[PDB]
Design an enzyme around this catalytic site. Sequence first.
Site, PDB file in Angstrom:
ATOM      1  CG  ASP A 141      -5.502  -0.398  -1.382  1.00 54.07           C
ATOM      2  OD1 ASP A 141      -6.433  -0.763  -2.075  1.00 54.07           O
ATOM      3  OD2 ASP A 141      -5.553   0.847  -0.858  1.00 54.07           O
ATOM      4  CG  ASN A 142      -4.697   1.907  -3.881  1.00 53.39           C
ATOM      5  OD1 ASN A 142      -3.890   1.964  -2.895  1.00 53.39           O
ATOM      6  ND2 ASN A 142      -5.903   2.052  -3.662  1.00 53.39           N
ATOM      7  CE  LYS A 180      -1.128   3.183  -3.998  1.00 50.23           C
ATOM      8  NZ  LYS A 180      -0.882   2.399  -2.663  1.00 50.23           N
ATOM      9  CG  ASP A 229      -2.142   0.972   1.159  1.00 50.83           C
ATOM     10  OD1 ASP A 229      -2.485   1.253  -0.027  1.00 50.83           O
ATOM     11  OD2 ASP A 229      -2.613   1.487   2.045  1.00 50.83           O
ATOM     12  CD  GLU A 277      -8.452   4.457  -0.575  1.00 53.01           C
ATOM     13  OE1 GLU A 277      -8.712   3.440  -1.012  1.00 53.01           O
ATOM     14  OE2 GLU A 277      -7.436   4.934  -0.427  1.00 53.01           O
TER      15      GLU A 277
HETATM   16  N1  LIG Z   1       8.753   2.308   3.080  1.00 58.63           N
HETATM   17  C1  LIG Z   1       8.403   3.082   1.955  1.00 58.63           C
HETATM   18  N2  LIG Z   1       8.922   2.906   0.764  1.00 58.63           N
HETATM   19  C2  LIG Z   1       8.647   3.640  -0.280  1.00 58.63           C
HETATM   20  N3  LIG Z   1       7.139   4.220  -0.225  1.00 58.63           N
HETATM   21  C3  LIG Z   1       6.545   4.461   0.916  1.00 58.63           C
HETATM   22  C4  LIG Z   1       7.124   3.997   1.969  1.00 58.63           C
HETATM   23  N4  LIG Z   1       6.411   3.995   3.132  1.00 58.63           N
HETATM   24  C5  LIG Z   1       5.290   4.825   2.627  1.00 58.63           C
HETATM   25  N5  LIG Z   1       5.779   5.245   1.088  1.00 58.63           N
HETATM   26  C6  LIG Z   1       4.608   5.839   0.495  1.00 58.63           C
HETATM   27  C7  LIG Z   1       3.100   5.311   0.430  1.00 58.63           C
HETATM   28  O1  LIG Z   1       2.268   6.660   0.633  1.00 58.63           O
HETATM   29  C8  LIG Z   1       1.500   6.821  -0.096  1.00 58.63           C
HETATM   30  C9  LIG Z   1       0.836   5.376  -0.759  1.00 58.63           C
HETATM   31  N6  LIG Z   1      -0.543   5.439  -0.886  1.00 58.63           N
HETATM   32  C10 LIG Z   1      -1.048   5.876  -2.133  1.00 58.63           C
HETATM   33  O2  LIG Z   1      -0.160   6.431  -2.883  1.00 58.63           O
HETATM   34  C11 LIG Z   1      -2.533   5.858  -2.244  1.00 58.63           C
HETATM   35  C12 LIG Z   1      -3.348   6.889  -3.201  1.00 58.63           C
HETATM   36  C13 LIG Z   1      -4.661   6.609  -3.228  1.00 58.63           C
HETATM   37  C14 LIG Z   1      -5.241   7.604  -4.108  1.00 58.63           C
HETATM   38  C15 LIG Z   1      -4.871   8.897  -4.252  1.00 58.63           C
HETATM   39  C16 LIG Z   1      -5.467   9.986  -5.109  1.00 58.63           C
HETATM   40  C17 LIG Z   1      -6.468   9.631  -6.002  1.00 58.63           C
HETATM   41  F1  LIG Z   1      -7.103  10.560  -6.574  1.00 58.63           F
HETATM   42  C18 LIG Z   1      -7.074   8.200  -6.004  1.00 58.63           C
HETATM   43  C19 LIG Z   1      -6.510   7.197  -5.201  1.00 58.63           C
HETATM   44  C20 LIG Z   1      -5.292   5.613  -2.850  1.00 58.63           C
HETATM   45  C21 LIG Z   1      -4.695   4.735  -2.033  1.00 58.63           C
HETATM   46  O3  LIG Z   1      -5.307   3.757  -1.243  1.00 58.63           O
HETATM   47  C22 LIG Z   1      -3.203   4.848  -1.681  1.00 58.63           C
HETATM   48  O4  LIG Z   1      -2.770   3.779  -0.853  1.00 58.63           O
HETATM   49  K   LIG Z   2      -4.686   2.385   5.270  1.00 59.89           K
HETATM   50 MG   LIG Z   3      -4.105   2.436  -0.561  1.00 57.86          MG
END
Ligand SMILES: Nc1ncnc2c1ncn2CCOCCNC(=O)c1cc(-c2ccc(F)cc2)cc(O)c1O
Ligand SMILES: [K+]
Ligand SMILES: [Mg+2]
Length: 213
Positions: free
Chosen positions: A167-168, A142, A139, A197
């Site tokens: 997810d996603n 992406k 999650d 969500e």
């Molecule tokens: N250890 C690591 N290494 C690398 N990376 C790392 C890390 N730890 C954290 N991160 C970064 C992860 O943080 C954000 C990831 N999640 C999302 O980006 C996300 C975006 C939407 C979304 C947004 C806008 C829309 F219009 C429509 C959907 C929906 C979701 O359910 C999402 O999960």
């Molecule tokens: K969550």
């Molecule tokens: Mg997500």
Amino acid sequence: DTKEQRILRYVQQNAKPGDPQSVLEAIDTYCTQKEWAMNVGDAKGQIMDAVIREYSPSLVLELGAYCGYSAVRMARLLQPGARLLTMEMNPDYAAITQQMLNFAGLQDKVTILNGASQDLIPQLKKKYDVDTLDMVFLDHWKDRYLPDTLLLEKCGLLRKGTVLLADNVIVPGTPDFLAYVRGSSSFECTHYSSYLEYMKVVDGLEKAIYQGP
Ligand SMILES: Nc1ncnc2c1ncn2CCOCCNC(=O)c1cc(-c2ccc(F)cc2)cc(O)c1O
Ligand SMILES: [K+]
Ligand SMILES: [Mg+2]
């Protein structure tokens, strides 16, 4: 005052301390009525519950914690002694996740690792005493699903039967990850169609069971 800080304050003021279900419910109420947030949400959360209940994993790894919603959701269904490791690169999100887990009373079951997954994954065996993972919840960014999956295999962290739950896979989408696991003999995949969500937008979870080399 950030969105994540407002979500944490809402939970602390509208949920019962030590009650993970009231925590998820306050998060879902806040994001439906006040401000949208990227938590897995209730629709995908229910599928995630069904998967957790089926496999009863002893050791779960989550990539990307955000506010701790999915960590709370998974940790509340874990058996006594089962553990969750969650990697969060954003320090502000890692501090919110910790406080969220503290309020829900799940701090003893979860370890939040503040850092990049590509840097932390290779330290799991030696530093965190990990043999293999029973389940991985993807999650985070992406474009990291596929490289981090390949990195987990390289590090010997996957076993026959490791459940990858992503997810996603539709929104924002993970096309290279989805094409790879679906095309590989080393994964048995299942797509679980759902909704983004707090939105009337189609999304989905992909379960990819590692079959060995
Ligand atoms: N250890 C690591 N290494 C690398 N990376 C790392 C890390 N730890 C954290 N991160 C970064 C992860 O943080 C954000 C990831 N999640 C999302 O980006 C996300 C975006 C939407 C979304 C947004 C806008 C829309 F219009 C429509 C959907 C929906 C979701 O359910 C999402 O999960
Ligand atoms: K969550
Ligand atoms: Mg997500």
